């Protein structure tokens, strides 16, 4: 349950889940990826559909 | 607030409402001195207490 914020200090997502890391070229064991681990919370307004 | 805020910078005040801490630590000291002196002393003396007969005129 880590809050993901933008450059404006606003919480834009919530991330929680299980880390997946690779199991002589050793893999990086201090960095992992979570697929679909973050759920969005805020929506950015856009001008799409306006104007010509 | 929707403004941009950096992460790694030292959070210095940047706008009108920002607050800053001031440590006075003021210490000023100035001194001035001057002196002058002048001394003159003189003393002259002359006396016979015994005058030769030939010099008695002067």
The DSSP result for B29-45, as a single string, is: -----------------
B3: closest chain A residue by CA: A8
Structural tokens at position B16:
């009108």
User: In degrees rounded to 5, what are phi and psi of residue B39?
Assistant: -125, 130
User: Do B4 and A10 lie within an 8 Å CB cutoff?
Assistant: no
Q: Is B8 on the interface with A (CB under 8 A)?
A: no
3-state secondary structure of A33: strand
Give Cα A7 to chain centroid, integer Å. Answer: 14
Between CA B9 and CA B14 the distance in angstroms is 12
A14 membership: H or E segment, kind and range = strand A11-15
B3 vs A contacts (CB less than 8 Å): 8
- Resolution limit, Å: 3.7
The CA distance from A46 to A14, in Å, is 22
On whether the CB atoms of residues A20 and A32 are closer than 8 A, the answer is: yes
Q: Taking the C-alpha atoms of B47, B48, B54 and B58 in order, what is their torsion angle to the nearest 10 degrees?
A: 20
What is the Cα–Cα distance from A8 to B6, expressed in whole angstroms? 9
């Amino acid at each position: 349950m880590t809050p993901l914020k933008g450059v404006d200090s606003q919480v834009y997502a919530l991330a929680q889940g299980n880390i997946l890391v690779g199991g002589v070229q050793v893999n990086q064991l201090n960095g992992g990826r979570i697929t679909n681990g973050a759920i969005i919370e805020r929506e950015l307004p856009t001008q799409f559909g306006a104007g010509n | 607030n929707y403004g941009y805020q950096p992460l790694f910078e030292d959070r210095r005040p940047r706008n009108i409402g920002d607050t800053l801490t001031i440590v006075l630590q003021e210490n000023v000291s100035a001194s001035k001195s001057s002196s002058a002196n002048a001394s003159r002393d003189g003393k002259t003396s002359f006396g016979f207490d015994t005058v030769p007969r030939y010099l008695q005129g002067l």
